[PDB]
């Protein structure tokens, strides 16, 4: 096969963007290991203090919290969410057909790992090392560096692993320990051995198994109804697992000896129109096969020839049941990559619609580009730029689309250039700066006043704190790929450097690139992108993601850039990321009927809303209205979104259950978003509607007619 984890470029972004150091630094990071602190990772909370020390880090199926002060002894808190809490909102006609508005997990101390040495002292925390799949966390006694616990925190771990060094183990819970079986022997208050089956008084019953892997055994006294203290400082590894069911005690016994410490990810493409990525787990020893929990989308795409599936399942924070897999290597295949490039698969519109489309195109090209592309911020500017990039696109590929008008094609391309040029020269309202701390490019607007910013970290949607980089930069990349494809000589060198700095800021696939962090927004274990960046005072529900199509839009743009420059590894990686996105979207975000990964109340909502690591919220960041919530999952409508990502089956289910009732009532621009989505299953009804209703600010009527008129099953109504 051919390798996808290669650098895009090694251009030094300092030649284009003024350099800064991010004002908000990582408090708990080993500054002396040469690694880059990730801005949008599941490990990101670990690097900063949080309010009440309640910022969760979720390797899944365990959720962890550091140093939260309930239960007295600070340490590492574990929660394992067997059950979820549904909450609802006060009913309004803004959202008519809903009963479950949000799903959350209870912040409860299922079990804490600490020390009796830390009764009157608060331990110093540090992130000693990290990669994409893991982080090692050390809690040590202040001013006594040789007394510490190391926690290798790794995606999917079946146990919590704690390397104690010169400290006295203590295990507290918020529940009561009703029973304790040492070394499988059954009445006492002091216990001895290397295995401890403890059971709690919660609902449902949580059962934990504790393993002592060090040279000496452990001696635990039941101090409270909630605490097990050891006899003396212990040196060695202690592991704790939740027993999902009684018939898996032997499985946990067999795998107690081997722990993950990290993982290396690689990716290949093949000439069978496919691609794959592989996770090679880093372990401590190889004396036993590795046990690891996998997400629903892992089970359906893994190559089964080097792993054994088990029946052991625990609930994840928000992605449904995870299933343990046995093995040290995972190869995940996507055999069906997207065929989409610049246009719909049928590039030519129904012949009865050409005069109508050409009339609308002519109107849309006559628009005032300055007022529709020089918006207050980069985001809305990008929507305008891409929407006009589409019009120049279809007009200058008239040999395929049949929208012939050489004069209009050239004006479309000129006006697009004029409007895009200020962004290429970094002379827009909100110019970018290159950040040496976190190795990315950030908008200037959210920076403090001393760097030319507005002091508001929420300016530009949090882009200065690395939020929504793929939403924003997706539009500019699509635009530039279209300009560079239609006219490869226009500002070629600055264009190639500028566009690739953007692709690299979001999607650098290789540490060999010294200037950009690796995979800022993509997460290879979760199989989708994250939007939430640096969240001062903690991201108390972990990373978040709202828009899927806007993430799709960056990976489509990356792919188009790959087509416009002849870069096969870039084109192939973008495809693979689009294929994983599609699979995971239908596992977790856009729920068909019978979805196994959510409570039925949530499934009837059809979209998850805003998705976080620790909760899901049927709402938006800009208004709790049904057409906003479903509409945001429907723009920008591109050939990628129309031909590949949004499937007839889902569009159809969603339309019969939610949108059919509301799209025709809608009297805002969201009417155009909805009826363009509808053109996917019913172009015959959509086309007349798209002639009348209002357009989204990133949508044009002409392009929308064009995408509808190119559906294969289109007919005059
Ligand atoms: O009231 C008058 C006022 O109203 C405006 O109009 C509305 C219009 O702006 C709205 O536009 C939509 C736009 O918001 C939507 O955006 C998403 C964007 O949400 C997503 O962003 C999120 C961030 O929003 C978010 O930060 C959180 C913050 O929102 C929350 O409120 O508080 C927290 C602070 O304590 C903070 O954490 O963070 C995440 C990352 O973690 C971001 O991803 O990403 C993209 C862009 O970034 C985008 O998809 O986009 C829609 C386009 O699809 C826009 O429609 O639309 C409404 C439609 O009716 C309007 O009401 C007016 O325009 C103004 O003139 C007025 O001031
Ligand atoms: O329309 C007029 C005005 O509407 C506002 O739009 C609303 C929009 O702001 C709102 O979105 C919801 C978010 O506010 C909510 O975000 C929550 C965070 O705010 C909360 O943070 C903190 C935590 O960081 C801090 O440390 O402590 C606080 C107390 O413990 C805690 O509150 O973070 C939460 C996760 O950690 C997060 O939930 O998130 C919701 C998603 O669950 C959003 O729905 O949504 C409204 C309805 O959709 C919007 O109307 C505009 O912003 C205004 O400018 C408008 O004028
Ligand atoms: O009509 C909008 C008007 O009201 C404002 O909107 C509300 C919004 O505030 C609300 O968000 C809450 C989150 O705050 C909440 O988060 C939890 C924290 O509150 C707590 O401190 O910690 C836990 C961690 O365990 C957090 O999860 O989560 C609930 C449920 O997820 C949210 O509902 O959500 C409403 C729905 O969108 C929203 O309408 C807005 O700020 C006003 O300006 C506006 O006028």
Q: What is the 3-state secondary structure (H, E, C) of 447-489?
A: CCHHHCCCCCCCHHHHHHHCCCHHHHHHHHHHHHHHHHHHCCC
Q: Is 698 exposed, middle or buried (0-12, 13-18, 19+ CB in 10 A)?
A: buried
Q: What is the C-alpha separation between 582 and 586, in angstroms, rounded?
A: 7
CA 16 to ligand 2 centroid distance, Å:
35
CA atoms within 13 A on the CB side of 481: 30
**Cβ neighbours of residue 403 closer than 8 Å, sequence gap 6 or more:** 349, 354, 357, 358, 361, 394, 395, 706
- Which residues in 69-168 belong to E strands, given as ranges? 76-79, 85-87, 102-104, 111-115, 124-130, 134-141, 144-154, 159-167
Say whether the peptide bond before residue 550 is cis (omega within 30 degrees of 0): no
- Catalytic-residue membership of 546: yes
How many CB atoms lie under 10 A from the CB of residue 662?
A: 19
How many CB atoms lie under 10 A from the CB of residue 286?
A: 9
Contact yes or no for 278/269 (Cβ under 8 A): no
- Packing angle, helices 701-709 and 670-678, rounded to 10: 10
> In which order are the strands placed within the sheet that holds 85-87?
85-87, 102-104, 615-617, 610-612, 544-545
Q: What is the C-alpha separation between 147 and 257, in angstroms, rounded?
A: 23
One DSSP character per residue, 409-451 reads HHHHHHHHHHHHHHHHTT-SSS-EEEETTTTEEEESTTS-GGG
Query: Has 472 been labeled as part of a binding site?
Result: yes
Q: Which of 532, 609, 610, 619 to mutate to test the pocket of ligand 2 (most atoms within 8 A of CB)?
A: 619
Same fold? 26-78+109-256, 349-419: no
CA 638 to ligand 3 centroid distance, Å:
32
Q: What is the C-alpha separation between 524 and 516, in angstroms, rounded?
A: 18
Q: What is the C-alpha separation between 457 and 463, in angstroms, rounded?
A: 8
CA 86 to ligand 2 centroid distance, Å:
19
3-class secondary-structure state, position 684? helix
Of ligand 1's listed atoms, the one at least distance from the Cα of 463 is: 47
Q: What is the C-alpha separation between 33 and 458, in angstroms, rounded?
A: 31
For ligand 1, whether the C-beta of 471 sits within 6 Å is yes
Report phi then psi at 605, rounded to 5: -75, -20
Domain ranges of the chain: 1-25+79-108+257-348+420-667, 26-78+109-256, 349-419, 668-717
Q: At how many Å resolution was this determined?
A: 2.7
CATH fold group of domain 668-717: 1.20.5
Q: Which of 546, 621, 632 to mutate to test the pocket of ligand 1 (most atoms within 8 A of CB)?
A: 621
For ligand 3, whether the C-beta of 624 sits within 6 Å is yes
Q: Which ligand is nearest to the CA of 620?
A: 2
Contact yes or no for 562/261 (Cβ under 8 A): no
Helices (DSSP H) in 469-599: which residue ranges?
A: 469-486, 492-507, 549-565, 568-584
Helices (DSSP H) in 547-667: which residue ranges?
A: 549-565, 568-584, 600-603, 626-631, 639-640, 648-654
> Closest Cα partner for 556 from 485, 673, 645?
645
Which DSSP letter does residue 583 get? H
Query: Has 264 been labeled as part of a binding site?
Result: no
Which DSSP letter does residue 571 get? H
One DSSP character per residue, 283-345 reads ES--SSPPEEEE-HHHHTTB-TTS-EEEEEEEE-SSS-EEEEEESSEEEEEE-------SS-S
3-class secondary-structure state, position 114? strand
Q: Is 333 exposed, middle or buried (0-12, 13-18, 19+ CB in 10 A)?
A: middle
> Closest Cα partner for 643 from 672, 594, 683?
683
- Catalytic-residue membership of 376: no
What experiment produced this structure? X-ray
- Which residues in 588-702 belong to E strands, given as ranges? 610-612, 615-617
Q: Which of 622, 635, 669 to mutate to test the pocket of ligand 1 (most atoms within 8 A of CB)?
A: 622
Q: Which CATH superfamily is domain 349-419 in?
A: glycoside hydrolase family 81 endo-[beta] glucanase (1.10.287.1170)
3-class secondary-structure state, position 217? coil
One DSSP character per residue, 1-23 reads -EE----S----GGGTS-EE--S
For ligand 3, whether the C-beta of 654 sits within 6 Å is no
Supply 7's token pair: 């650098």
Query: Has 414 been labeled as part of a binding site?
Result: no
Query: Has 25 been labeled as part of a binding site?
Result: no
> Closest Cα partner for 375 from 431, 416, 428, 444?
428
Q: What is the C-alpha separation between 5 and 275, in angstroms, rounded?
A: 12
For ligand 1, whether the C-beta of 531 sits within 6 Å is yes
Residue 604 vs residues 196, 593, 649, 653: alpha-carbon distances, Å: 42, 8, 15, 10
Q: What is the C-alpha separation between 601 and 102, in angstroms, rounded?
A: 10
CA 420 to ligand 2 centroid distance, Å:
33
> Closest Cα partner for 536 from 23, 40, 49, 78?
49
- Catalytic-residue membership of 550: yes
Q: Is 52 exposed, middle or buried (0-12, 13-18, 19+ CB in 10 A)?
A: middle
Q: What is the C-alpha separation between 483 and 342, in angstroms, rounded?
A: 12
Q: Which CATH superfamily is domain 26-78+109-256 in?
A: Golgi alpha-mannosidase II; domain 4 (2.70.98.30)
Q: What is the C-alpha separation between 367 and 607, in angstroms, rounded?
A: 34
**Cβ neighbours of residue 440 closer than 8 Å, sequence gap 6 or more:** 39, 434, 466, 469, 505, 516, 517, 520
Q: Which of 219, 334, 523, 550 is catalytic?
A: 550
Q: What is the C-alpha separation between 84 and 342, in angstroms, rounded?
A: 43
Query: Has 546 been labeled as part of a binding site?
Result: yes
**Cβ neighbours of residue 243 closer than 8 Å, sequence gap 6 or more:** 197, 207, 208, 209, 249, 252
Q: Which of 131, 468, 541, 617 is catalytic?
A: 468
Contact yes or no for 644/582 (Cβ under 8 A): yes
Which residue owns the Cα nearest ligand 1 atom 28?
Answer: 621
Which DSSP letter does residue 90 get? -
Residue 198 vs residues 23, 181, 620: alpha-carbon distances, Å: 46, 7, 42
- The helices-and-strands tally (H runs, E runs) of the chain is 18, 33
CA 462 to ligand 2 centroid distance, Å:
13
CA 619 to ligand 3 centroid distance, Å:
10
Of ligand 1's listed atoms, the one at least distance from the Cα of 628 is: 58
Q: What is the C-alpha separation between 641 and 331, in angstroms, rounded?
A: 27
């Amino acid at each position: 096969g051919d390798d996808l984890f290669v650098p895009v470029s090694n251009f030094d972004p300092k030649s284009i963007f003024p350099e800064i150091k991010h004002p908000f630094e990582p408090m708990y990071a080993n500054t002396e290991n040469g690694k880059i602190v990730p801005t949008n990772s599941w490990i990101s909370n670990l690097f900063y203090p949080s309010a009440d020390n309640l910022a969760p880090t979720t390797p899944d199926p365990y959720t962890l919290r550091l140093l939260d002060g309930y239960g007295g002894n600070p340490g590492l808190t574990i929660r394992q969410p067997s059950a979820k809490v549904l909450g609802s909102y006060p009913p309004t006609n803004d959202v008519p057909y809903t009963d479950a508005g949000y799903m959350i997990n209870s912040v409860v101390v299922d079990l804490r790992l600490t020390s009796s040495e830390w009764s009157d002292v608060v331990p110093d925390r540090q992130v000693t090392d990290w990669d994409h799949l893991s982080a090692n966390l050390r809690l040590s006694t202040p001013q006594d560096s040789n007394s510490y616990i190391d926690f290798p925190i790794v995606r999917g771990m079946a146990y919590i692993t704690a390397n104690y060094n010169n400290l006295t183990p203590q295990f507290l819970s918020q529940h009561a320990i009703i029973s304790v079986e040492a070394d499988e022997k059954k009445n006492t208050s002091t216990f001895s051995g290397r295995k401890f089956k403890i059971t709690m008084n919660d609902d449902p019953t949580s059962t934990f198994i504790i393993y002592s892997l060090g040279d000496k055994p452990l001696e635990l006294r039941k101090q409270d109804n909630s605490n097990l203290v050891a006899s003396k400082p212990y040196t060695g590894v202690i592991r704790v697992a939740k027993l999902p069911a009684p018939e898996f005690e032997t499985l946990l016994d067999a795998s107690r000896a081997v722990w993950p410490t990290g993982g290396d990810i690689s990716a290949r493409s093949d000439d069978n129109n496919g691609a794959s990525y592989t996770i090679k787990w880093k372990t401590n020893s190889n004396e036993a096969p590795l046990l690891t929990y996998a997400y629903a989308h892992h089970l359906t795409s893994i190559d089964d020839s080097n792993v054994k599936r088990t029946d052991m399942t625990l609930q994840s924070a928000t992605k449904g049941p995870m299933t343990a897999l046995v093995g040290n290597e995972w190869t995940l295949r996507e055999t069906e990559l997207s065929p989409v490039e610049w246009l719909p698969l049928q590039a030519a519109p129904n012949p009865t619609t050409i005069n109508e489309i050409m009339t609308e195109i002519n109107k849309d090209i006559a628009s005032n580009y300055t007022q529709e592309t020089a918006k207050e911020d980069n985001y809305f500017s990008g929507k305008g730029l891409q929407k006009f990039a589409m019009l120049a696109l279809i007009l200058n590929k008239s040999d395929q689309t049949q929208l012939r008008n050489p004069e209009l094609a050239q004006i479309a391309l000129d006006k697009l250039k004029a409007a895009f040029l200020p962004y290429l020269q970094n002379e827009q309202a909100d110019p970018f700066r290159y950040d040496t701390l976190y190795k990315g490019i950030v908008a200037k607007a959210g920076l403090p006043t001393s760097m030319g910013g507005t002091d508001d970290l929420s300016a530009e949607f949090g882009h200065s704190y690395y939020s929504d980089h793929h939403y924003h930069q997706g539009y500019f990349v699509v635009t530039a790929a279209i300009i560079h494809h239609l006219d490869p000589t226009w500002n070629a060198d600055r264009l190639k450097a500028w566009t690739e700095a953007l692709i690299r800021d979001v999607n650098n696939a290789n540490d060999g690139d010294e200037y950009f962090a690796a995979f800022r927004n993509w997460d290879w274990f979760a199989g989708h992108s994250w939007a939430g960046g640096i969240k001062p005072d903690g991201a108390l529900d972990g990373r978040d993601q709202e828009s899927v199509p806007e993430s799709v839009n960056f990976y489509w743009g990356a792919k188009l850039w790959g087509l416009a420059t002849g870069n096969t590894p870039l084109t192939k990686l973008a495809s693979l990321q689009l294929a994983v996105t599609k699979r995971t979207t239908y596992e977790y975000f856009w729920m068909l009927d019978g979805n196994k990964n959510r409570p039925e109340n949530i499934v009837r909502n059809k979209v998850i809303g805003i998705y976080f690591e620790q909760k899901t919220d049927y709402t938006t960041y800009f208004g709790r209205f049904l057409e906003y919530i479903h509409g945001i999952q429907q723009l920008p409508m591109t050939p990628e979104l129309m031909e590949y990502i949004r499937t007839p089956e889902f569009v159809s289910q969603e339309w019969d259950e939610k949108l059919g009732a509301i799209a025709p009532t809608v009297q805002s621009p969201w009417a155009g978003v909805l009826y363009l989505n509808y053109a996917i299953i019913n172009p015959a009804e959509a086309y007349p509607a798209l002639r009348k209703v209002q357009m989204d600010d990133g949508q044009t009527r002409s392009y929308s007619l064009y995408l509808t008129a190119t559906r294969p099953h289109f007919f005059r109504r």
